Curated annotation (Swiss-Prot), chain A:
Family: Belongs to the EMC1 family.
Disease link: Cerebellar atrophy, visual impairment, and psychomotor retardation: An autosomal recessive, neurodegenerative disorder characterized by developmental delay, intellectual disability, hypotonia, scoliosis, cerebellar atrophy, and variable dysmorphic features.
Quaternary structure (record): Component of the ER membrane protein complex (EMC).
Cellular localization per UniProt: Endoplasmic reticulum membrane
Function: Part of the endoplasmic reticulum membrane protein complex (EMC) that enables the energy-independent insertion into endoplasmic reticulum membranes of newly synthesized membrane proteins. Preferentially accommodates proteins with transmembrane domains that are weakly hydrophobic or contain destabilizing features such as charged and aromatic residues. Involved in the cotranslational insertion of multi-pass membrane proteins in which stop-transfer membrane-anchor sequences become ER membrane spanning helices.
Glycosylation sites: N271, N366
Name of the protein in its database record: ER membrane protein complex subunit 1
UniProtKB/Swiss-Prot annotation, chain B:
Record has Transmembrane as a keyword: yes
Family: Belongs to the EMC7 family.
Job description of the protein: Part of the endoplasmic reticulum membrane protein complex (EMC) that enables the energy-independent insertion into endoplasmic reticulum membranes of newly synthesized membrane proteins. Preferentially accommodates proteins with transmembrane domains that are weakly hydrophobic or contain destabilizing features such as charged and aromatic residues. Involved in the cotranslational insertion of multi-pass membrane proteins in which stop-transfer membrane-anchor sequences become ER membrane spanning helices.
Record's subcellular location: Endoplasmic reticulum membrane
Keyword Signal assigned: yes
Gene Ontology cellular component terms for the protein in this record: EMC complex; endoplasmic reticulum membrane; membrane
GO BP: any one term: protein insertion into ER membrane by stop-transfer membrane-anchor sequence
Residues included from the entire protein: 82 to 162 of 242
GO molecular function: carbohydrate binding
Protein name (database record): Endoplasmic reticulum membrane protein complex subunit 7
Subunit structure and binding partners: Component of the ER membrane protein complex (EMC).
Keywords: Endoplasmic reticulum, Membrane, Signal, Transmembrane, Transmembrane helix
From Swiss-Prot, chain C:
Protein name, as recorded: ER membrane protein complex subunit 3
Family, similarity comment: Belongs to the EMC3 family.
Assembly behavior: Component of the ER membrane protein complex (EMC).
Organism name: Homo sapiens (Human)
Lumenal topology ranges: 26-52
TM stretches of this protein: 10-25
Location of the protein in the cell: Endoplasmic reticulum membrane
Parent sequence residues shown: 106 to 157 of 261
Function: Part of the endoplasmic reticulum membrane protein complex (EMC) that enables the energy-independent insertion into endoplasmic reticulum membranes of newly synthesized membrane proteins. Preferentially accommodates proteins with transmembrane domains that are weakly hydrophobic or contain destabilizing features such as charged and aromatic residues. Involved in the cotranslational insertion of multi-pass membrane proteins in which stop-transfer membrane-anchor sequences become ER membrane spanning helices.
Swiss-Prot record, chain D:
Tissue expression per record: Present in serum (at protein level). Increased expression seen in the left ventrice after myocardial infarction (at protein level). Expressed in the pituitary gland. Expressed in brain.
GO biological process, alphabetically ordered: angiogenesis; positive regulation of angiogenesis; positive regulation of endothelial cell migration; positive regulation of endothelial cell proliferation; protein insertion into ER membrane by stop-transfer membrane-anchor sequence; tail-anchored membrane protein insertion into ER membrane
Residues of the whole record sequence present: 50 to 210 of 262
Family: Belongs to the EMC10 family.
Oligomeric and partner information: Component of the ER membrane protein complex (EMC).
Protein name: ER membrane protein complex subunit 10
Length: 397, 81, 52, 154, 61
């Protein structure tokens, strides 16, 4: 679908796809390589059988590319889009099968050599929600995985419901933030930080709880292990450069609540040349604050710009169909409960537990998107415009 | 113009008439297990308060909403100071 | 004579500042050019008027 | 009262899994304190850790899920373990229901700077063991807001 | 003011006077902060650190 006029340019059909199959779309090669065609890969997996297949197509013309995808004999579990590229500027894609072997694509000689030289720096994490298990596997030289780390959230009291990790295609402009005082506070930009959110299997209105763990993706260290009491799902979490924001229901007072977790390091950065998840002995400090949202929610996703210069906004998807553009600066956890000279220097609004849903903030005016399912945000060009596609029953751009 | 919602268990629920043409103020409704049930104005802060509103909800609209924001269009008198 | 000389002395700078104010209103909200040297952050409130 | 949890370590040239018993953790649920009682390294273990450090291998820790129903494990750069004079901290994270969730091991200081280390250094285990229960997140603050707005109105 | 050789010394005194003004300028900086001496003014100069360990995946497909 052309993003400007909304017309349809090409349609294709995948024969024999079950309704409950799980998909995963990856842009393997963009259009900045004119001598080579753009190429995308779609990964389907029938739930009943378990067999998964890969369909590779040109995303511009819609015809299947002549590059034959490999026949995935074993059922697969997870996929990775490594930033390393082949000679034809195709991003390497990795699949982990059921026998925990690794299949590459395009898996040419150059790709195999490149990822064999870079093997020990590639980690998979598989979150088995049925058993409440999390595993993290290395990548050996000969394309095999070993049990690097393993955690178990007991399913008898907690089931994993969301594993939202930070988007790979984003950049952070300001590593730190000005605190006033002529000093700087450094954000804890960890690129391998999961945000696994679990619900309490106890459905009683008074004993239910919702846990959020900021599990690292490489070393398995639990950065944060928050557990909110007297709360019930569904929970909608967005994970961004530094912060995480997860909306939930509060059973005790019957009101939807936000809870912003901001990760901050010390006044001086531990290391600036490079970041390694194996070399972070200082647990980042966590700043939390809970706000009241006066309505329900259906989908969230932060607005993303190419260089991250533009401020961040959350696209709250209300049941009414509107798309509220809540400024992230409002959800700062450092907003003091009593204003001080430091806050005035930093221009921090005093803490207000109520978040307004003023109708002038909606990014759509009356094109309500009934039964909203998700919000996709694309960086686009420029620096102030982020493309928004709210998909559900209706589809709006 | 009236409305009826069925299959409601006992508790507290915020009722809102969503309509893109004209907004409607939400109203909280507390229904008990015995059967008596009441309406009031929602207040997510200090929820213990009670501001009774008649049960046959007369949720009169407040005109069309204000999704749009008018252009600035500053004048020379604005440039003066 | 005092009023005339004061007005003449005033008209050497004040028109420039009034033109600057008119330009600031008329062309508010843009990013026009990049100054090729790294100015200090404390100079932000006056270089970037009209930008959030 | 007190429950004992096994704790194994592993480090090899091929970076495979050869977990061997290292220490017992006495987690007393009443007062919420955890103490470890490990045996010091031997000559062959010290040598093996030396080659693992040379090849930039990994030092993996693993504990049983229950006091053989499963295991929870993690790893740390073993060369960073030897370049920190065997000074490390393992934190045991559990959940609200008092079930073992995970073990996280990290050295002090982290990373590596090419510091050559003599054998005599590796005869002590400077391990700081902590237990981290889930920290309750704060709810929204309403009393302060209502009192402040009442003062504003008056 | 070159009536004699003392002009040279007078010049130094003049420089001293200028130095006095320069000293006041420093005070003005202390009264305004318009000088790139703190680390905060260096914030825009910090390039983002490169990622060393790559980790992807998520819920079971
Ligand atoms: C139609 C569009 C108008 C055409 C352009 C207007 C011509 C202005 C030329 C001009 O004669 O103006 C230049 C003066 C110079 O300054 P001056 O005070 O030394 O000479 C003025 C002596 N006096 C103070 C006694 C007047 O500067 C000024 O006033 C510039 C005034 C700035 C206002 C911009 C007008 C906005 C458009 C409408
Ligand atoms: C920051 O982390 C890196 C990675 O652990 C440390 O190691 C440096 O890594 C770079 C990139 O490969 C090399 O060029 C350097 O030679 C490495 N340094 C050493 C001493 O081996 C790096 O030292 C860390 N920075 C600081 C200041 O500790
Ligand atoms: C044993 O490990 C502890 C860490 O648990 C070390 O304590 C640290 O010591 C350094 C300086 O020696 C301080 O900068 C850190 O703040 C300390 N950490 C904590 C948590 O207090 C201790 O030094 C180690 N002992 C030896 C002999 O190496």
């Amino acid at each position: 679908i052309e993003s400007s006029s909304g017309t349809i340019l090409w349609k294709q059909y995948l024969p024999n796809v079950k309704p409950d199959s799980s998909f995963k779309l990856m842009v393997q090669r963009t259009t900045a390589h004119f001598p080579h065609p753009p190429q995308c890969t779609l990964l389907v997996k029938d739930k009943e059988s378990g067999m998964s297949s890969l369909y590779v197509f040109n995303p511009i013309f819609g015809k299947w590319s002549q590059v034959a995808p490999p026949v995935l004999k074993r059922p697969i579990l997870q996929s990775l889009l490594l930033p390393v590229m082949d000679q034809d500027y195709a991003k390497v894609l990795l699949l982990i099968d059921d026998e925990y072997k690794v299949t590459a694509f395009p898996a040419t000689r150059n790709v195999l050599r490149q990822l064999h030289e870079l093997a020990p720096s590639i980690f998979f994490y598989l979150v088995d929600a049925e058993q409440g298990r999390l595993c993290g596997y290395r990548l050996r030289k000969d394309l095999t995985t070993e049990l690097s780390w393993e955690l178990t959230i007991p399913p008898e009291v907690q089931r994993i419901v969301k594993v939202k990790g930070k988007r790979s295609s984003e950049h952070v402009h300001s590593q730190g933030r000005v605190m006033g005082d002529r000093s700087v506070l450094y954000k804890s930009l960890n690129p391998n930080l999961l945000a696994v959110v679990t619900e309490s299997t106890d459905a009683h209105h008074e004993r239910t709880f919702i846990g959020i763990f900021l599990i690292d993706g490489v070393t398995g260290r639990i950065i944060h292990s928050s557990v909110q009491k007297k709360a019930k799902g569904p929970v909608h979490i967005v994970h961004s450069e530094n912060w995480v924001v997860y909306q939930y229901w509060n059973t005790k007072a019957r009101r939807n609540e936000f809870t912003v977790l901001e990760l901050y390091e010390g006044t001086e950065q531990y290391n600036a040349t490079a970041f390694s998840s194996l070399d972070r002995p200082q647990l980042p400090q966590v700043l939390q604050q809970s706000y009241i949202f006066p309505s329900s929610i259906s989908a969230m996703e932060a607005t993303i710009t190419e260089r991250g210069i533009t401020s961040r906004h959350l696209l709250i998807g209300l049941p009414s169909g509107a798309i509220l553009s809540l400024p992230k600066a409002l959800l700062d956890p450092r907003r003091p409960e009593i204003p001080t000279e430091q806050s005035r220097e930093e221009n921090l609004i005093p803490y207000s537990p109520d978040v307004q849903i003023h109708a002038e903030r909606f990014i759509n005016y009356n094109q309500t998107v009934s039964r909203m399912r998700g919000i996709y945000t694309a960086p686009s060009g420029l620096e102030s415009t982020c493309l928004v596609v709210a998909y559900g029953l209706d589809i709006y751009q | 113009g009236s409305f009826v919602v069925h299959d409601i268990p006992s508790g507290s629920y915020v009722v809102e008439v969503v309509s893109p043409a004209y907004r409607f103020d939400p109203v909280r409704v507390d229904i008990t297990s015995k059967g008596k049930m009441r309406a009031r104005y929602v207040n997510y802060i200090k929820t213990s308060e009670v501001v009774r509103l008649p049960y046959p909800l007369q949720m009169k609209s407040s005109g069309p909403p204000s999704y749009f924001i008018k252009r600035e269009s500053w004048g020379w008198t604005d440039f003066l100071m | 004579m005092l009023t005339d000389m004061m007005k003449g002395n005033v008209t050497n700078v004040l028109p420039m500042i009034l033109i600057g104010g008119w330009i600031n209103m008329t062309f508010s909200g843009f990013v026009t050019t990049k100054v090729p040297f790294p100015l200090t952050l404390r100079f932000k409130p006056m270089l970037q008027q009209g930008i959030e | 009262g007190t429950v004992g949890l096994l704790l194994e370590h592993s480090f090899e040239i091929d970076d495979s899994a050869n977990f061997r018993k290292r220490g017992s953790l006495l987690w007393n649920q009443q007062d919420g304190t955890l103490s470890l009682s490990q045996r010091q390294l031997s000559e062959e273990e010290r040598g093996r850790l030396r080659d693992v450090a040379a090849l930039n291998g990994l030092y993996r820790v693993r504990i049983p899920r229950r006091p053989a129903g499963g295991y929870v494990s993690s790893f740390v750069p073993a060369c960073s373990l030897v370049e920190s004079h065997l000074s490390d901290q393992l934190t045991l994270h559990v959940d609200v229901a008092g079930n073992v969730v995970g073990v996280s091991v990290v050295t002090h200081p982290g990373g590596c700077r090419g510091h050559e280390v003599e054998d005599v250094d590796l005869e002590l285990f400077n391990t700081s063991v902590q237990l981290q229960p889930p920290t309750t997140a704060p709810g929204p603050e309403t009393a302060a807001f209502i009192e402040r707005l009442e003062m504003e109105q008056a | 003011l070159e009536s004699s050789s003392q002009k040279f010394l007078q010049g130094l005194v003049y420089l001293i006077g200028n130095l006095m003004g320069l000293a006041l300028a420093v005070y003005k900086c202390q009264s305004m902060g318009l000088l790139p001496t703190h680390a905060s003014d260096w914030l825009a100069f910090i390039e983002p650190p490169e990622r060393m360990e790559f980790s992807g995946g998520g819920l079971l497909l």
